[PDB]
Design a protein around this ligand. Structure first.
Ligand SMILES: COC1=C2C[C@H](C)C[C@H](OC)[C@H](O)[C@@H](C)/C=C(\C)[C@H](OC(N)=O)[C@@H](OC)/C=C\C=C(/C)C(=O)NC(=CC1=O)C2=O
Ligand SMILES: COC1=C2C[C@H](C)C[C@H](OC)[C@H](O)[C@@H](C)/C=C(\C)[C@H](OC(N)=O)[C@@H](OC)/C=C\C=C(/C)C(=O)NC(=CC1=O)C2=O
Lengths: 214, 214
C-alpha cells in the first residue's frame, strides 16, 4: 500500500557515505557479513524454538539461500531466520543510533580494514560496497511482511508488502548491484567467496542457478 | 483480498474427473502441453508487439522457465507471454464450454491416447495427470495480477494477487504434484521429458536448480 518515510540518524548516513563511496579493495566481504547475519537470525529462531516450538511452523526449514537475478542486476540473500517487525526495521535499521557506528568510522579513517566492520556491529552496511540500493524484505511471526528500502541517501521507506513472494518467515536482502560489481551474479565467483570467508556455518547455504536446457 | 467463486461448466468438471482419476501411462505429456501453451502465449505477445512494441516493456525478455520447489512438492511453469485478464481466466478456464471438451472425452473413451488432448484444444487439463491442485497466476498488460485456483472439484476461485512475486507480464502454472508423481521435481527427469517431446521451441527453456554449496 502507501509508504512511510523516515530520516536516517545523522551518523548512519555518514557511515553509508564512507562505504558506498571510498573503501575499495576487499569488497567481497559484504557476503561474509550478510551470511553471518543470516546465521545469527537462524540461531535466534532456533534458540527461541527450544521453549516455543510452534515458532518453526511458519517455515520448518532452516536455510540460507543465494539467488542471482542477472536480468535485474540483482543479488538476493535469504534466510528463514527470525525475521524483523515493522518496529524492528524502523528502529534498528536507521532511526536509533547504532552503538558502534561512530567508533568504526574513526577506526576506518585511522587505517582499519573494512573487514573489521562486523566487529563494530554495523556489518549490514557493508552491502553498499557492491550495491547502490537495497530492499530488506522481512517476515516475523509477530507481524506482517514489510519492505524497508534505502538508496544510501538520507532517508528510507517502509512499506506493507503486497508485491513479493510470501516468505513464511525470515528475510530477503535484495541487492541492486552497481555496474562495476556484476561479478557477484556469477556462480563460480559466489562459491569462491563463500568458501574463503564462510567455511564455518551451521546451516545449509543454497545457491539458485538458472540454466538453459539444450 | 477476497475471493470470488465460480462453478465449472458441467463437461469441464467431467473432463477433469476422467483425467485426474483414470488415464495412467503417458503422464509426462502434461509438460509438452504446458510448454506448448507457454510457447503460444509467447507467440501472441510477440506478434502483438509487431504493431505495438510498447507491449514488450513490462517484461522485455521472452522465455519459458521451469522451477521445481521440492519443499512444497510444487512444480512451476512460467512464461513471459501475453498473460490473461480476470475476465479471461474466468471465461476461458472454466465457465464457457470449450468446443473440444466433449469430443475429446468421446475420443478418449473410444481408445484415443491422452497425448491427443492438445489437438482437441483442452491440453491445459493434462496437468491433472500429475497434480491434484493448480494455481494459475497471470498478469496481462491490460489488467492486474490474479490467481485462479482449482482442485479438480466442481468450482474454482479467482483472487486479486497480493501474495506472490510480481511477474511483469505472463503466467505461472503452479502445480501441486501428487505423491506418486514427485519425480517431476527431479532435474534429470525434467531435461529428459523436454528433449523427448519439446525439441522444437522458439524460446529459451530455463531450468531453475537449487544446489547446496560445499
Ligand atoms: C546480534 O544481532 C545483530 C545486531 C543487532 C540487530 C539489530 C539484531 C536484530 O534486531 C534486534 C535481530 O536480532 C536480528 C535477527 C536481525 C538481523 C541479524 C538482520 O539480518 C537478517 N535477519 O538476516 C540484520 O540485517 C537485516 C538487521 C540489522 C543488522 C545491523 C544493523 C548490523 O549492521 N549488524 C548486526 C548483526 C547481528 O547479527 C546487528 O546490529
Ligand atoms: C490457441 O490458444 C489456445 C487455446 C485458446 C485459449 C483460451 C487462448 C487464451 O485465451 C484467449 C490465450 O489466447 C492464451 C495466450 C492463453 C494460454 C495459452 C494459457 O497458457 C499460458 N498463457 O501459458 C492457457 O493455460 C493457462 C489458457 C487456457 C488454455 C486452454 C483452456 C487449453 O486447454 N488449451 C489451449 C491452448 C492454446 O494455446 C486453448 O484452449
Amino acid at each position: 500500500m502507501a509508504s512511510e518515510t523516515f530520516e536516517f540518524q545523522a551518523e548512519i548516513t555518514q557511515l553509508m557515505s564512507l562505504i558506498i563511496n571510498t573503501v575499495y579493495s576487499n569488497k567481497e566481504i559484504f557476503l561474509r557479513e550478510l551470511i553471518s547475519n543470516a546465521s545469527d537470525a537462524l540461531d535466534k529462531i532456533r534458540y527461541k524454538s527450544l521453549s516455543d516450538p510452534k515458532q518453526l511452523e511458519t517455515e520448518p526449514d532452516l536455510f540460507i539461500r543465494i539467488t542471482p537475478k542477472p536480468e535485474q542486476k540483482v543479488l538476493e540473500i535469504r534466510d528463514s531466520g527470525i525475521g524483523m517487525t515493522k518496529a524492528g526495521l524502523i528502529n534498528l535499521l536507521g532511526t536509533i543510533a547504532k552503538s558502534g557506528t561512530k567508533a568504526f568510522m574513526e577506526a576506518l579513517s585511522a587505517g582499519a580494514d573494512v573487514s573489521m566492520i562486523g566487529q563494530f556491529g554495523v556489518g549490514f552496511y557493508s552491502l553498499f560496497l557492491v550495491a547502490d540500493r537495497v530492499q530488506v524484505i522481512s517476515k516475523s511471526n509477530d507481524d506482517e511482511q514489510y519492505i524497508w528500502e534505502s538508496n544510501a541517501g538520507g532517508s528510507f521507506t517502509v512499506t506493507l508488502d503486497e508485491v513479493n513472494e510470501r516468505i513464511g518467515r525470515g528475510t530477503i536482502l535484495r541487492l541492486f548491484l552497481k555496474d562495476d560489481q556484476l561479478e557477484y551474479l556469477e556462480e563460480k565467483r559466489i562459491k569462491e567467496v563463500i568458501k574463503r570467508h564462510s567455511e564455518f556455518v551451521a546451516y545449509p547455504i543454497q545457491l539458485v542457478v538458472t540454466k538453459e536446457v539444450e
